[PDB]
């Protein structure tokens, strides 16, 4: 209820800084985003 009233305690500048740091890190690591599990995924059964 206090979070509903007093808003998000993380300021917009703080969240933008965190998001920007994550973007620059994941760009520096050449990270490929994880795709949605495809229907033609050949590893669905073993993960299941």
């Amino acid at each position: 209820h206090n979070h509903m009233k007093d808003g998000p305690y993380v300021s917009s500048e703080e969240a933008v800084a965190i998001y920007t740091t994550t973007v620059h890190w994941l760009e520096a690591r050449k990270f490929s985003p994880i795709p949605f599990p495809s229907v033609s995924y050949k590893h669905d059964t073993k993960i299941l």
Binding site: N2, H3, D6, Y9, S11
Partner: peptide
């Protein structure tokens, strides 16, 4: 305009 956390 300051931010008051839940714990203070």
């Amino acid at each position: 305009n300051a931010v008051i956390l839940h714990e203070d």
